[PDB]
Structure formats: C-alpha cells, structure tokens
Design an enzyme around this catalytic site. Structure first.
Site, short mmCIF file in Angstrom:
data_model
loop_
_atom_site.label_atom_id
_atom_site.label_comp_id
_atom_site.label_asym_id
_atom_site.label_seq_id
_atom_site.Cartn_x
_atom_site.Cartn_y
_atom_site.Cartn_z
CB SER E 364 27.35 150.01 25.46
OG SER E 364 26.87 149.41 24.27
NE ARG E 365 34.79 147.45 24.57
CZ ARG E 365 35.76 146.54 24.57
NH1 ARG E 365 36.50 146.35 23.49
NH2 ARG E 365 35.99 145.82 25.66
CB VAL E 366 27.67 150.59 19.55
CG1 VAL E 366 28.44 149.34 19.15
CG2 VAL E 366 26.43 150.27 20.36
NE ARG F 181 35.58 143.51 20.51
CZ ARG F 181 36.63 143.83 21.25
NH1 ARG F 181 37.73 144.30 20.69
NH2 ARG F 181 36.58 143.69 22.57
#
Ligand SMILES: Nc1ncnc2c1ncn2[C@@H]1O[C@H](COP(=O)(O)OP(=O)(O)OP(=O)(O)O)[C@@H](O)[C@H]1O
Ligand SMILES: Nc1ncnc2c1ncn2[C@@H]1O[C@H](COP(=O)(O)OP(=O)(O)O)[C@@H](O)[C@H]1O
Ligand SMILES: Nc1ncnc2c1ncn2[C@@H]1O[C@H](COP(=O)(O)OP(=O)(O)O)[C@@H](O)[C@H]1O
Ligand SMILES: [Mg+2]
Ligand SMILES: [Mg+2]
Lengths: 127, 48, 62, 188, 495, 467, 310, 128
Positions: E364-366, F181
C-alpha cells in the site's frame, strides 16, 4: 465505391465547363494532405515513381497512380502543404547525384549536403 | 394482505385499460382537436 | 384540470370500478387458481398452523 | 480550389454530393430555377422505357451511354449546366442513381425558398375549416420569409389527437402516447 | 384502490416541442439515428420504447447511439427524442439503502428514488491542487489488511486474485465494518459505502443485498447492479454511475467508499462495444482505449483538501486474473493506475488460510501514513517478523532460525479470520500484541485460532475500559501496554 | 477564419471552413464553451474540411458550432517565469496563482536541431546508485531510459534521480509528467515546495512542471510531452544553460497517439499501434538533444506493456537512448531494489577510454560472472547446487553476493523500507565490487550484502549477524 | 406481412419488407419449402432490409421467395405433454411419433427474472447420491459443471439424477442436447426408454428431450439451449416446481454462437470467439435461477479446449 | 445409395483437411468474413453435415449401413488446431498414428493410448 476525386470541388469544375482553363497534364492540385501522404488530382502525364515538386519547395514521389488521383509521398513534413496546393512535375524518375565529390560528405537521403560544408559539386545522377 | 392488495391492483388496471380502449371510440374528437389546436398555439407562442 | 379528456375518462372509469366493487369484479377462474398456488407456497413456507391459532410450546427442562 | 457556394441544406452521400456540385454551379450565374426545370424534365426523360432499360444494362460501352445522353440533351436544348451534369454522371457511372440526385436537388431548392416542410398524422380526415385553422396556427411557428408546406397523412395506429412534425420539431398529441404515459406513470 | 386513482392524477401529461430523429439501422447494439441536428455529443437520447441511449458518434449524416438496453426493443423507423442533457444520474442521500441499476432506476421495488440532484457520469477528476495527501485511516476490519497492507481515505487500493479467493468477501467485510462509525456522534468518521456489481450473477447480488440487510449495513450502502444479463453498454456505464454517486459525497464534505466488482468484466463489455463498433483491436483484442477507460474512472478516487470541503472517495477495484497471471494486460493496466494492491493467492486459499492475502506481494503506497499509531506500534514488528519468516521458509536448524519459523507460523495462524466477522481496531491491536511480543510461542500452532477466539471473549467481556482507552487515545501508552501484558499473561495462564 | 464543426467522434473533431483552411498543426478555438477547448489540426480531408484532435473533453459539442482559427500552432508561455509553476498541455497554469506573466511564447511544434548543431562530448554522470554507476554509467547531456513493467520501480527510481541529481544541480529543470497518476504529481509538487526547489514567494525556483496526467483525454496526453520539450528547449537555447528534463511516463505519448489514430481513419499497424509510431516518436525524441547552444539531460521512464520488451513501443524507443536501464519484475520479486537488470542495462560510455580501465574491467567482470550464473540457473533449478563442480559452486556464491550487493536503499524509499538512504560514491562502488570479485569476502553470507551502502556496511552487517 | 428474400449468402439470408419490419429476434417462415425453414432476425440493415440467420439448410432459396413474418420469436409447445417427446429448436417433434399437443406456447427469447423475483436463501438440492450430496453438494437454482468424457458413467449418472429428482421432489427434467451427435442422441433416447425415465405408453415420462443436431446450421445449435430453457421455465413458473436442466454440451453452445457471429460479419474477439461471448453466456445462464415460484438446476457438461482452463 | 438399399458401404475421405482448404479458398474469394485461421464459419457445418450421413438404418429402412473413415493430417502432432478439433468432436473415435512409434518398429504406428472408439467393444466379435 466513391472515387477520391469525386469531391464537390471537382465535380463543380467539371459541371460548369471550367476545367479546360487549368493544366491537368503537367500539374495537379492537392485534394487531401494528411499524415505525410498527398492525394493529387491532375498530373495525367506523371510517370510511376516519378518525382514531383510541390508549391513550397517540398518534393514528393508519385507512388500510386490510381484512375482519378495520384498518391504522392512527401520527402519532408507536410506541415506546409495545404489542400489546393499546386503540384508540378519534375519530369524524371527520382534520382540522386553521384561521383567522387560526395566522398567525405554527410549527404542526405536525397543528395543534399547536411554537414554545412557547401553544395555537392556532383556531375552525374543515377536513378 | 400485501399479496392480495397487489394482485387486485394489477387485475384492476387490466380491467381499466380494457375499459379505456373500449371507450376510446366515444365521440369527443372535435373538442379534442380544438383543445390540441389551442395547445399548438400556446407552444408556438413560447417558441418565439 | 377536467379539460384533458383522458384524465376525466380514467376518473369516471375508475368510479364505475368502485361502484361495481360492491363485490370484487371480474375474478375469473384463473384468479382462483393463482390464489390457490400463491397461498399454497406462502403457507408451505410458513407452516400448516391455523389462520389465527394462538399456540404454545409447552416448555420442558434439561 | 474554387470556393463553391454552400447550399442552404446539406445533403450527404454520392447523391447529395453531386447535388451540391450542381447547386454551387447554378447558384453562380443565378440559374437555379431554369436548372431545376431541366432537371425535372430529365426526370421524365430518363423514365422512358427504352432509355430506362438501356441505361441499366452494364454491357453497353459507357461511351455509348455518354453518346446517347449527349444526343438526348442536345435535342432538348438543356442549359449547359444540365448537359454537363448528365455527361459527368455518365462518365462516372452514377446515372443509375440519378433520381436520387435530382430529387436531392429539389429538396435543396425547397429549403432555398423557405418551403419548410411539415406533416400531420391523424386517425381520420380533417374538415377543411379545421385544416385551415391548423395551417394558420402552424404558420405561426415559422419565421419571416418561410412558408408552410403542409402534408396531411392518415394512420389508424394512433387513436386520438394527432402527431405534428415541423421540420425538426415534433409534437405527439396522439391518444396512444397519452394512454401509454398514463399507464406507465400510474404503474410506476 | 382510490390511491391508484390519485396516482393517475398529478402525472405530467403536458406535451412539449422537442427535437426528434428517426432510426436508420439497429443491430450489434449501436443504432444509427437520422436527424437530431442539435444533439450534443455524449447526450442522452430516448427511444420511443422507453429505452435510453448515449449519443456516441456525431457523424455528418447520422448519429451513432449506443443503446442502454436490449436492442430487440428498437425497430427501424422508431423515433428518438433528445433529452438535452449529457448522460446524467441521480445522486443524493435518497439513494442510500437502494439497489439502483446502472442509470438510477430502482430495481428494488420500494417505490422510486426521490433524488433531487443529478451528476454527469462523464465528469473530470480533480486536478492537482484540490487533492491532499492521504491522512485518515479506512478501517477494513480485517486483521491482515488493517495491519500489514493498510488503506487510507482517498487511496484507491486494488484487490486482485483468481476465481473464488475471497475478493467479494473482503469487500463485504469492509462494507459491514463501517457500521460502528456510521452510528457514532462525529460525522467525520462516517463512511457511506457504495458497491458496484458489474457482470455478476443476479442471484449473487440478491444474496449480497440480503446479507447486507441482515447486518444492518444497508442504511448507508448503495448497490449499483449491472449484472451478467444486462447489455454491455450498461456494464460499461455502471462504474461511472457509481463513481458519480460517490463523487457527490466527496464534493459535499463527506466520505465515500466505492467497490467496483469486477473491473475485469467492464473491460470485457467495453471490448464488446468496441469490436461491434469495428474499432481496431489491439493486444488480446482489447482496444487501445482500454486504459483511458479505467484511468479516467479511478482517477476520481481523490481526497480533497480542507479548502474544498475535505471529503474523500476511496476506491477498491476488484480485478480477476486467469491462472493468477499478474502480468496480463488488464491487471497491469490497473496495477499502474492504483495506489496499492492486495494479492489473493489461490493456493494460500486452498490451504484454509483465509483471507488469502499474499503479504509478500501486497503493498500500500500510502501505507504507514494514515494508520492508527497503536496499530503501527504493534504491526511494524509483525511486518519485520513475517519478512524474516518468509526469507527462510523454503526448507523444513539453529535457535534463531527455528525461532523465526515458529514465530512466523504463529503469526500466520493469528492472521486468519472468519467471514462477516470484522474486528474493531483495538481488538486487532490486542490480538497482534499477544502474538508478536511472544506470549504464544509455546502454544501449539493448531490451537492458535481457538485461543484467539477465547481471548477475544475475555477481553471484550471484562476489560472494555482498556479497549476504550486505546480507541480514544489512539496509541498504546506504557501503562496501557503493561495492563495489556498482564491481561494476556493471566488469560494464557488458564491453559 | 471561422469554420463549423461537422463531426465529433471521440476526441477527433472534423471541422469545415468556407474561407481558407488552416495549415496542418494549427490550433483552433471552439467558440461557445464554458472553458477553453483547443482543437489542433491534423489532416486535410478535402472539401475545405480538416480533421482535428481535441485537447480537452469534447462532450457537449453540437454538430454545427463555430470554430475560430488561431493562425499559429499551440503556443505556450516560456521564460524564467514558468519556474515553479504548473502547466497543462495548452500552457494554462493549473496551480491557482495567477497567469504566467512572460514576455515570450513558444510554439510546441518546432523542428529538431540540425545535424550541424549536435554536440559530441561524452562525460559520465554520477548518480550514487551502485548498479547504475557500475554497469550503465549515465552520460551527462544524453538521453536516459528506465524501462519497466507496472510496479517495478520506474517512479521511485526517477524520484531518487530527481533528488540526487537535481538537488545537487546548478541549472534549471523540467518535469513533464505525461499520463501518470494525479496524486503522484500532487505529492511531487508538495515535496518540492518543502525542499525549497519550488518557491511560492520569490523568483528562486529551479523546476518547471508540466502535467498531462492520466485523467486527460487522449488528445492532451499525446501533446503534453511536446509542451515539456518546448519549456526545456527554451532554457537550452535562449539561456545557454544546462537543463534536466524528467519525463514519466513517455509510453503514454505513443499510447495516446494510438488511441486517437483509429479515429483518424488509418490502417492499424502491428499490434493495433498507429502506422506512424516510429516517426511520431522520432520527431519528438529528436528535439531532446544536447547541442552546441545548451545541454539537456533527459531521463525518460518507459512503460513496457504486459512486460513485453519486444512490444513495438519500447522496441522502437530503444534506439533513441544513450543509456537504458531495464527494471525487471523477476528481480523485484526477489526483493532486490532497484530492480535493474544488470545484463539488459547498457550505456554508450562503457568505454575503457571514457570510464578508465579499472571501472570498465570491474563492470565487465561483474557482467561475466552474472552471465555465467544465469547460464547455470537452468541446471540449478532441477539438479540442485549439489551437482556443480567446485568452481561452479564458487561462481554461484560470488554471483549471489553480487546480485545482492547491487541492491541499495534509496532515500525516497525510507517510508517503504525504513532503512536510511545511501549515496555510494563511484570509487566506493568500484572498490567494493573489485573486492567481491577478488574473493576477499568469500567467508561472509549472502545476506550480509542485502541492502547496504559501501562494502564497509556489508562487513559490519556480517559482524552483526555473526553474533 | 410478407417480405422477399433479397440475398442468400451461406446460412445468412437478407429479407426485404415493404410495409413494416419485424423487431429483432422475430421468426420468419419462408414460403415454398417442403420442410419448414425458419429465419431468425438479427439486424436491421436499413432500406427496410433485415439480415437473418436460417435455422435449416438454405439450399434452393430463390431471390424473391415470399417470407411471412410470424409475429413473435420462435414459439414452442411447453405443456406437460412434451415429456418423453423429442423436439428440435423450432419446436417440431423429431421422433416421428405424432404432433406435440399442448395448450401453451412459449417464446424462446425471454429475459432473466428481475431482481425482486430472486430468492435470497441458498438451499441444497438433494440428488440422493451420497458422493454428490456430501463432498460437492448441488444448490437449487445453481449451475453445475460435469467433467469427464466417455466410458465413465456420464449417461448413467444423468439418468440417475433425473430419476431421483423426479422421485424425491416431483420435479421433471429437460435435456437440451446442444450439438448432439445423431448416433449418441438415438442411443440416449433408447437408454432412457429402457431405463424408464422415458415411457412410450403410460404417459408418465420424467424427461423432455430437445435435440439440436450437429448437422444443423450454426443458427440452430446456438438456440437449442434456449428451447430447453423455455420448456424448463414453463415447468418452473406455470407449474411451480424444481426442475433439472441438462445441457450436453455447453462448449458447443459457445462455439455455435461464435460461428453465427462470424457469419454475420463481426470482428472476432480474443481467440476467435464472438465479441458478445460474455453476454451470450449471460443471457442464457441467467435464466437458470431459483425465483420465488421454483428453480431450475442446470447440469452442464463442459469440454475444456486444449486442456486449457483459461 | 448402398446404405438405402440394404447394402453396407465404407467411404474413406482422404483427406478432410484438403476439402476444408478448398472451401476456405472459395469463401475467401467470395469475400466472406474470414474467422479463425481464415476458415469461414461453416468449416464445422461443412464437415458435420457430411460425416453425419454415416448411419446404420434399422430393419424398417432396409438395414443397410455406411461407415466413414475420414483421414486428417495434423501438423506437428497438433490436434488442437481448428479443423482437427472440428472433426474430432464430430466422430465416434480416432486412430492416432504417431511417427515416433513408426520409426522404432511399431508399424502400423497406431498409438493405442490416444486412440479410442466411443462405440467400443459393442462392435467386436465375441471371440475378439
Ligand atoms: N475469510 C474467509 N474465511 C473463510 N471462508 C471464506 C473467506 N472469504 C471467502 N471465503 C469463502 O470463499 C467462497 C467464495 O469466496 P468469494 O465469493 O468471496 O470469492 P470471490 O473471488 O468473490 O468469488 P467470485 O469472485 O468468483 O465471486 C465463499 O463460499 C466463502 O465461504
Ligand atoms: N528502491 C525501492 N525500495 C523498496 N521498495 C521499492 C523500491 N522501488 C519500488 N519499490 C516498491 O515497488 C512499488 C513500485 O512503485 P513505483 O515504482 O512508484 O511505480 P511504477 O509501477 O511506476 O514503478 C513501490 O510502491 C514500492 O513499494
Ligand atoms: N453405477 C454404475 N453401475 C454399473 N455400471 C456403471 C455405473 N456407472 C457407469 N457404469 C458403466 O460405465 C459405462 C459408461 O457408459 P455410459 O456412462 O452409459 O456412457 P458415457 O460413457 O458416454 O457416459 C456403462 O456402460 C456402464 O456399464
Ligand atoms: Mg465475488
Ligand atoms: Mg509510476
């Protein structure tokens, strides 16, 4: 089976009997330029794979000889050609200069020096 | 209760559409045309 | 509001329906068979108890 | 290329494309009415059984077609525009769809003079008083210069009221649509 | 009865002057309409049969109209009336608890949708200034997802896995778990879930709605079903309808969660639409457009900053991979659009390890951002320990190696979970605490599940005060740590 | 002039003029819109009709609107006033700080530098990344490519390059995020604001930003790259200053060009790609060059669709780059990061006369040993390592040590990994790999090399593990 | 209304009406054939022409033959008198045993039961077979794949399921042999007659056989599954009971759809399958469900091409 | 003709792949939609409506019969190609003839693992 040169701008010339005023043997008009290929109406006497010259110095090579138009390929960027431009023959199958003058020159695909050392002083040309 | 209510409802509407399609032959054509012509007049008035 | 013929038409036809509803009008046997089957599935889902019997479990102990 | 004058209404396909060519040709020189006359005359000419059967056979040299058409257009002394158009169609091989061409031109001419078409569909005929008041009201929809071109029609599928079409605009006052709308709205 | 007569009255019957066109040819699901001179592109025209269509192509002589129904209800010569509005859908809180189809037409019974506002399905994502970094946590109620691969509010995770590996189950557990927040006092923690079912069996969605109603989870959920039978131009449109119903909340200061399920069955509907439009197929017969289709849809799952309301719209696309090929076309198209991923192995699932998150590949890139501090304390250690266990599990020597193997196996047994059994954050904290600090290394792995259950029963029964302390102060203080330590030791004593 | 729309299919609008047509590549304004929708001409269909590609959403376009010719191609504001701003394709500011008040505009469709202007000097650019420095040394003033599938490191790597190179730079910089993005663009903006690279209250900004992120229609994605090229070409020429131009993801340029090439009525090429793929790429990448007036260092991130390096898009772009860096999913699944593939990365300055002899020899020894191990892998995967000669076992041990040692922890990956980010100077890299090849560390275990900076840290970690 | 065959290209016939076209999926009867040729409408080409797919051989069709528009999709008899009778796609009996006498007719192109009609509790059809009912229980209104080719007991298992469901539930069964070898179809018919599930005398048969032969144009093999669903849907709705629906084979259904789509001239999908593969499967499979009146449980023999499950 | 007169026939098509190739040429020159491997959509109907004429009439119809032995060539033992699978799903068996067995002495090279006969031993004399 809609011909390419069956546009209205051409059928109108035909209808009101004005086509005789323009030369449709050693000259033509760009029906449609797009993506680097021109369709040309006219040039009834243009040879297959003959070179032709547009009205902006750009050259092309008439590849397709279709019944009513001519598929020409531009040896350059078609940013400068516009519908209705006058394409005039060059008379000779595409040919390039040759000789010992080219030796040591960074010549272009068409025989034009791109090293900036001056024109190629060639004498003979080969198809 | 719910089943009976809904079923009677659909049956009622079927009977009513039978009645309306039957009675459509009733002679009211002239007043109908008159009122719709007036409505066309209103529509045109709004068109401009 | 009454000028629109269709509105008054539906109104009067439903009025006639209401008066003819002294008893329910135009059942048709199909109506009865549909009632039969749907009530059958309903009770079968529910059970075989009476319409309105207030029952009891008669509890017990371990 | 030349600047062909755009016809008022745009048609598409080969038919409308020849028609646009002809309209732009005639508009210059202001020969629209006479050109339309010769067109509606070739409309009768080409229906001739001999010519009709000859021009549909593909086994007669196209030059034969052109020669016959030049003969039949020199006999009638058609304007140079119409003769040129027919020769053009014969050369290109589209004369098989000439009636679509001339028809298109007729349309392209109506829109020129303001014959904004219309259409009325009813379940029965209409009394001339009612039809005349209908025409008078419909005239109010148009603009200055335009003139109504009514076309009555009869269908039994729609029960009451009627359906009116004014060019693009369209109003459905049928009893069928009203019944459907009531039934859907009440059901839903 | 007379209620029906009233139903008759008040129905709009006023006629209007409206532009119209005539159908030329209907077949392959694309009608060719003639006329409609003043029709906008992407407008919503309406056929004479009550159907609706989207004006796709404005060609010079006709209009290509994609029909939003069964093209068998459209003849040639029909009448098409332009409704003069780009494709719109109804939005508002009036939809919550309603199963609307791809166009907002309630397929639920239960009367009609009383919406008073409409959005455009073809809107544009928020730019670069409105967005703000992801800060708040989205509690999935699933131990593995909440601890290892957390999610934030505004993030757009992906759930990717094979047939029947528990993707819909993770989605449904996430939806159900939000019940506690959606009852509390602060509107800042309420999440209004949405669930888009695309190309799914209708019976499945019916049972899913029944389950969500059992768990009292329909007070806030909207189900937008474009099931298997529905025409392709509806499965293609359903995600955009749902995303609009979510953008409404996002733009009105609230928080929404939208679950597209699946997005691999929208791209198939779009491939059908394109190939029937004759567009040039590409890789796997998908049109080259098949990226923009998902990018434009998933770029709306934003997180607006406080100067723009502060709302948010989490997204959980569900992709389905044949034979678990993560490197296929659509899976990579979406893996490069999203902010994370949860890989659901089909062999972990077949081992009974459910949910089957493959923690090796999931990310999860947060991540650590937007995670409760307490869970961070407890779960960073678990992440490191699981990493070490995975590094060595390829053979089954010394004390440290066997210690790593044993601790890893215990943690794996600890992360299993049951269906429709979400756990509050404090409960996950407590369990993973008892697991990682080492109060389980003696208990047999096979019993680790049973222990868990019993432990919860005790903790939720006696020490609710400690769990409330953890929840309020979202952090494990030293005194809280000591109390939890003694609780765990005491409970384990009784074994 | 003034034409009128006659067709609108997707993002391709056919317009008709009754007076003179606009020449190809011009821009046209759709009069009567709630915003600015620019249509860029692309073809001349005939009948005084042109076919244009819209640079914005074409929803709500009525057949018959009015389109007004601009007379010149899309022109964007360029100059030192674009530093620290953000720009969309048509050059409007999208950061909400008022207009870009420059003196001078540039057309985004200029021509490539002529052959009599190309520079030839080649010099190594040190990045602090072990594998990049050792095997594919980047050249200062030349194009660079990062080839990657989806989720392998292209963006973390390009952010590490941004940090390392740019922050320690003197010249300007341009980041042209094409088709990527939106939240990443926002995070980059707010990450450069806090680094002082972008200044919101002064004129000391060093970075221009241009964005065509993935929510944009195909028309915009296919041209934002040209806007970035223009903003950087200016700083190259009208300033005579070294520029850095990062592009991510350049594959979206060609992908968008193919999404909007079926509608232009072209016969699709190999894999559905436009027939003009190679030429469209060439006319763009041929303007990103160091010439005798300036020097652009371009770092381009190339997506590799479905992890196919023989796909026409990456296959075509391989011929435009000085140094490539093929990030591979196979390595990343092993946890090594950056996932660079040592045997696919290449450079044009891997010359013993450019990088010296020790550097070249070490790099080639590393590649030789990695290649030998790769050849062995086929047997190893079945008959195990217990079926190899002793020299082969030793080679495999060295190869695994080297594979691990190439992995490095980046500064921008602290939040992921938690490890402290390291810059390894070039001499330290050469020394460490020379030692590993000599055999000075045959006693340590493989894991002693995993995610460490210079080899001193490797020895320290081995000591820590030994206790 | 009567149109005129204008074009005949293979199995695709283009008809030209003059008054009013028939909506898509209608059935048209060609006048002048010894057998009964039915064309199913597929497109509205414009100019009052409709392109259609033939259910039988289109040999001998002249350009001009009169074609009568039936007025509704293919309609078949769906009484309880179908049981024990073989019938083909267009509803004719192919067992040369006399006409199928029924008071009900059903149109084979229906729509899936709406969302409200769906049943929400998931039951368990009890087949009475221990292994099937213990390890892999069958679900009412569920689809069931059946792998394994020949020599393993597929036909005997089908007969046993038919018998047990008719005996322990009172629910009949339908067997839609899509793409059925004529030899195998006859063998199945005679095995059933021997085993009692079909009975030619006492009118207590428990099976309705529908056969779409392997020598019929693709337009027919792609619709026989819908004929089976039509009969079974009658048994579910108009008789409120559980039903079994065997589909042998289900691969040949998708293949027939693929050939029809190719004939019409649609760009093939991924691996040559029709672009509409997903929704072609959905419209059929989505009518096999457990509504509030009854349920259809479908047992679908499955063939996996090239041993490739993807 | 022999089937319908109480006689028994045996027809051997050799091959049925070349009939498919000829049909494909005809179609592609008539400009019909290509389909897989350029085979039209009727290369199943073509062969099915041919091989379904091999029957065994009951005594009421004469009792005659007509066997069929279509021959197919497979390129590289690829039996998942288009026509090989079309004709494998129509017939009541198959007799594979692998070349590997041909060259190691096994002639006829009838691979008896892959060969089958869905009719089976129902058509074998009691001794055999
Ligand atoms: N956490 C879990 N624990 C135990 N069983 C589970 C869990 N999650 C899912 N399952 C089981 O897996 C089966 C199918 O799971 P689910 O339907 O959620 O997967 P899916 O990917 O949605 O399937 P499909 O996508 O094909 O609909 C269910 O019967 C369910 O009981
Ligand atoms: N140097 C690294 N160290 C640790 N993890 C990394 C590294 N590079 C990439 N990753 C992981 O791989 C993922 C790839 O993301 P990213 O590289 O940003 O996108 P892209 O798909 O464009 O390469 C990251 O989210 C991160 O979790
Ligand atoms: N329960 C059973 N008891 C006895 N024999 C069985 C059983 N199931 C299958 N068989 C045998 O297996 C053979 C398989 O043939 P069958 O299943 O009828 O055709 P197919 O193989 O085409 O399905 C039968 O001949 C039968 O004798
Ligand atoms: Mg699911
Ligand atoms: Mg990236």
């Amino acid at each position: 089976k809609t011909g390419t040169a069956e546009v209205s701008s051409i059928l109108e010339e035909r209808i009101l009997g004005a086509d005789t005023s323009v030369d449709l043997e050693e000259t033509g008009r760009v029906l449609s330029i797009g993506d680097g290929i021109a369709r040309v109406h006219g040039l009834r006497n243009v040879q297959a794979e003959e070179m032709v010259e547009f009205s902006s110095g750009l050259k092309g090579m008439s590849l397709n000889l279709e019944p009513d138009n001519v598929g020409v390929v531009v040896f350059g960027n078609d940013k400068l050609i516009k519908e209705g431009d006058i394409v005039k023959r060059t008379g000779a199958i595409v040919d390039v200069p040759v000789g010992e003058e080219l030796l040591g020159r960074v010549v272009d695909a068409l025989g034009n020096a791109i090293d900036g050392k001056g024109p190629i002083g060639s004498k003979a040309r080969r198809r | 209760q719910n089943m009976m209510r809904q079923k009677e409802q659909e049956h009622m509407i079927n009977w009513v559409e039978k009645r309306v399609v039957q009675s459509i032959s009733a002679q009211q054509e002239k007043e109908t045309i008159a009122k719709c012509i007036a409505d066309l007049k209103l529509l045109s008035k709004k068109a401009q | 509001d009454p000028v629109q013929k269709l509105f008054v038409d539906k109104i009067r036809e439903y009025r006639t329906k209401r008066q003819t509803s002294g008893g329910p009008v135009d059942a048709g046997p199909e109506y009865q068979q549909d009632l039969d089957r749907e009530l059958f599935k309903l009770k079968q889902m529910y059970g075989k108890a009476d319409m309105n019997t207030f029952p009891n479990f008669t509890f017990e102990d371990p | 290329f030349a600047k062909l004058v755009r016809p008022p209404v745009q048609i598409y396909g080969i038919e409308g494309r020849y028609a646009t060519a002809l309209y732009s040709a005639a508009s210059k020189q202001n020969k629209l009415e006479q050109v339309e006359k010769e067109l509606l005359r070739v409309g009768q000419i080409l229906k001739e059984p001999k010519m009709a059967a000859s021009l549909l056979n593909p086994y007669v040299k196209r030059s034969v077609k052109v020669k016959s058409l030049s003969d039949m257009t020199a006999k009638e002394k058609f304007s140079p525009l119409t003769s040129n158009l027919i020769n053009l169609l014969a050369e290109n091989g589209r004369l098989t769809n000439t009636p679509a061409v001339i028809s298109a031109f007729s349309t392209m001419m109506s829109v020129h003079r303001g014959e904004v078409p219309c259409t009325v569909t009813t379940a029965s005929a209409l009394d001339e008083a009612t039809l005349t008041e209908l025409k008078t009201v419909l005239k109010s929809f148009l603009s200055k210069g335009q003139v109504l071109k009514l076309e009555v029609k009869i269908d039994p599928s729609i029960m009451g009221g009627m359906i009116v079409r004014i060019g693009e605009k369209y109003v459905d006052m049928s009893a069928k649509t009203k019944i459907q709308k009531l039934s859907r709205a009440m059901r839903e | 009865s007379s209620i029906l007569e009233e139903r008759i009255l008040g129905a709009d019957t006023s006629v209007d002057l409206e532009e119209t066109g005539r159908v030329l040819s209907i077949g392959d699901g694309i009608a060719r309409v003639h006329g409609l001179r003043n029709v906008q592109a992407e407008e919503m025209v309406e056929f004479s049969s009550g159907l609706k269509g989207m004006s796709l192509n404005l060609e010079p002589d006709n209009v290509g109209v994609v029909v939003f129904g069964n093209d068998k209800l459209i003849k040639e010569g029909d009448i098409v009336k332009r409704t003069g509005a780009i494709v719109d859908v109804p939005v508002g809180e009036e939809l919550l608890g309603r199963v609307v189809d791809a166009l907002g037409n309630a397929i639920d019974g239960k009367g009609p949708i009383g919406s008073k506002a409409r959005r455009r399905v073809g809107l544009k994502a928020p730019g670069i200034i409105p967005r703000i970094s992801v800060r708040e946590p989205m509690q999935t109620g699933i131990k593995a997802v909440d601890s290892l691969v957390p999610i934030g509010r505004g993030q757009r995770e992906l759930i990717i896995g094979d047939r029947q590996t528990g993707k819909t189950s993770i989605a449904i557990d996430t939806i159900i778990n939000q019940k506690r927040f959606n009852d509390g006092t602060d509107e800042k923690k309420k999440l209004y879930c949405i669930y888009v079912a695309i190309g799914q069996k209708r019976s499945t969605v019916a049972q899913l709605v029944k389950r969500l109603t059992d768990a009292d989870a329909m007070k806030y959920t909207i189900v937008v079903s474009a099931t298997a039978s529905d025409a392709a131009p509806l499965q293609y449109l359903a995600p955009y309808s749902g995303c609009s119903m979510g953008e409404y909340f996002r733009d009105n200061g609230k928080h929404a969660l939208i679950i597209y399920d699946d997005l691999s069955k929208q791209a198939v509907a779009y491939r059908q639409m394109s190939l029937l439009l004759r567009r040039p197929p590409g890789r796997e017969a998908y049109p080259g457009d098949v990226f923009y289709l998902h990018s434009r849809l998933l770029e709306r799952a934003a997180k607006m900053n406080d100067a723009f309301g502060g709302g948010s719209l989490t997204a959980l696309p569900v992709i389905e991979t044949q034979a678990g090929d993560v490197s296929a076309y659509i899976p990579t198209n979406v893996i490069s659009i999203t902010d994370g991923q949860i890989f659901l192995e089909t062999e972990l699932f077949y081992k009974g390890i459910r949910p089957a998150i493959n923690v090796g590949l999931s990310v999860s890139r947060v991540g650590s951002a937007a995670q409760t501090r307490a869970m961070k304390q407890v779960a960073g250690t678990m992440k490191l320990e699981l990493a070490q266990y995975r590094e060595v599990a390829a053979f089954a020597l010394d004390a440290a190696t066997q210690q790593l193997l044993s601790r890893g196996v215990r943690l794996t047994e600890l992360l299993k979970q049951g269906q429709y059994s979400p756990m509050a954050i404090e409960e996950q904290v407590a369990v993973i605490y008892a697991g990682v600090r080492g109060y389980l290394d003696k208990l047999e792995p096979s019993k680790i599940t049973k222990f868990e259950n019993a432990f919860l029963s005790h903790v939720i029964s006696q020490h609710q005060a400690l769990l409330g302390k953890i929840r309020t102060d979202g952090k494990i203080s030293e005194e809280s740590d000591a109390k939890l330590k003694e609780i765990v030791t005491n409970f384990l004593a009784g074994f | 002039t003034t034409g009128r729309i006659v067709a609108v299919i997707g993002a391709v609008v056919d317009v008709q003029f009754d007076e003179g047509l606009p020449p190809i590549l011009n821009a046209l304004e759709v009069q009567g819109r709630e915003t600015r929708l620019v249509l860029e001409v692309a073809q001349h269909l005939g009948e005084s009709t042109v076919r244009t590609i819209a640079m914005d959403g074409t929803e709500g376009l009525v057949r018959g609107q009015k389109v007004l010719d601009s007379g010149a191609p899309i022109r964007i504001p360029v100059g030192p006033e674009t530093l620290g701003r953000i720009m969309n394709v048509i050059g409007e500011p999208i950061d909400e700080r008022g207009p870009i008040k420059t003196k001078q505009f540039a057309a985004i469709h200029a021509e490539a530098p002529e052959f009599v202007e190309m520079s030839v000097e080649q010099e190594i650019l040190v990045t602090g990344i072990k594998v990049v420095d050792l095997l594919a040394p980047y050249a200062k003033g030349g194009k660079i490519g990062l080839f990657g599938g989806a989720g392998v490191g292209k963006t973390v790597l390009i952010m590490e390059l941004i940090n390392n190179v740019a922050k320690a730079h003197g010249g300007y910089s341009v980041f042209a995020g094409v088709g990527e993005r939106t939240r990443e663009g926002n995070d980059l903006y707010h990450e450069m604001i806090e680094s002082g690279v972008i200044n919101l209250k002064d004129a000391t900004s060093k970075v221009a930003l241009v964005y065509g992120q993935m929510n944009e229609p195909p028309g915009a994605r296919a041209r934002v790259a040209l806007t970035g090229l223009t903003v950087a070409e200016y700083f190259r020429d009208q300033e005579g200053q070294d520029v850095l131009l990062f592009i991510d993801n350049i594959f979206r340029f060609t992908q968008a060009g193919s999404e909007v090439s079926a509608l232009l009525g072209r016969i699709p090429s190999a894999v559905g790609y436009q027939p003009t793929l190679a030429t469209d790429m060439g006319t763009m990448q041929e303007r990103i060059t160091t010439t005798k007036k300036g020097s652009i260092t371009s770092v381009q991130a190339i997506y590799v669709p479905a992890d196919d390096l023989t796909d026409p898009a990456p296959a075509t772009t391989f011929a435009h780059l000085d140094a490539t860096t093929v990030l591979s999913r196979a390595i990343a699944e092993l946890g090594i990061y950056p996932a660079v593939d040592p045997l696919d990365s290449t450079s044009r300055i891997m010359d013993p006369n450019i990088v010296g002899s020790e550097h070249y020899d070490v790099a080639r020894g590393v590649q030789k040993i990695l290649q030998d191990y790769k050849s062995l892998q086929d047997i190893i995967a079945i008959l195990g390592m217990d079926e190899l000669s002793e020299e082969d076992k030793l080679t495999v041990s060295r190869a695994r040590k080297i594979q691990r040692f190439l992995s490095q922890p980046f500064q921008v990956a602290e939040v992921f990994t938690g490890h402290l980010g390291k810059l390894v100077p070039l001499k330290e890299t050469i020394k460490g790999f020379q030692q590993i090849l000599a055999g000075e560390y045959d006693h340590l275990p493989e894991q002693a090399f995993y995610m460490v900076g210079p080899i001193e840290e490797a020895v320290a970690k081995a000591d820590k593990l030994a206790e």
